[PDB]
Amino acid sequence: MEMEKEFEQIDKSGSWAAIYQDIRHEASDFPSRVAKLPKNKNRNRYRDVSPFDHSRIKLHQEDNDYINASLIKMEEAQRSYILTQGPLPNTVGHFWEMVWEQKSRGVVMLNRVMEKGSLKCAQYWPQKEEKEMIFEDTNLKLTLISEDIKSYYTVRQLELENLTTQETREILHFHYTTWPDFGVPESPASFLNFLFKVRESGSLSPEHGPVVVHCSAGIGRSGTFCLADTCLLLMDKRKDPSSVDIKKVLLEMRKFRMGLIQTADQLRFSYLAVIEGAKFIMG
Ligand SMILES: O=C1CN2C[C@H](N1)c1ccccc1S2(=O)=O
What we know:
- Substrate binds at residues 181, 215-221, 262.
- It is found in: Endoplasmic reticulum membrane.
- By secondary structure, the protein is α/β, with parallel strands linked by helices.
- 31% of the residues lie in helices and 22% in strands.
- It starts with a helix and ends with a helix.
- The structure holds the ligand O=C1CN2C[C@H](N1)c1ccccc1S2(=O)=O.
């Protein structure tokens, strides 16, 4: 079926939970043996969210190459994304090592450091120009260059230096700051505006390594971001845009990381975002 009318048909019939459970039943199951090794316990935020072995990002290190991060490679859309958990106190150096080694231009953050009164990720970037951060375990230096605070999101320019070679690179930090503590946003308009700002920066384009996208677990909000982006790109590429099937795209993405889209409300919000986004694109 088309999307917008499949949408109204699920709303009127109140069957979002059943649609979402079908997706959960049909989703791929692949091994995640490296994630579960005892030496990696303090590298995982949640025991039930792990990268598959076949698609995990490897650190360029001989001691321990493990990080909780996955490469989502979308072949028809010609887009790639790295989806990862919010960094832990003992993995902030690994996180920036990955950004460096994979040649990413941008980092997309969809959570606040504290939500619901608990810590959802480490404070992994510097908050003041004159107070830079040094990660001694991976030999990197990180400096805040500029910050632009808007009503729904903040954009930061950061300098990452490999202290071993003295090479430097400019990294863009795109921080969506207004996702509610409970539920999903009422309108997709500010999320779409944010997606378009990431696109306009070049951070999603083939002349760079894959964008790094995270929330707390790196599957819910993060899944919503890449699902909406890929669906909108396919609608621009195909002769028949009504052929884009959001449930099929989501199952393709779940071949590369488990659990993408965590609730039926997140699934409905993804539909809404793609539907509204397709109208603004045209033309
Ligand atoms: O509260 C935490 C802090 N760490 C990351 C994660 N959650 C965890 C989970 C199991 C054992 C140890 C750890 S940790 O490394 O202390």
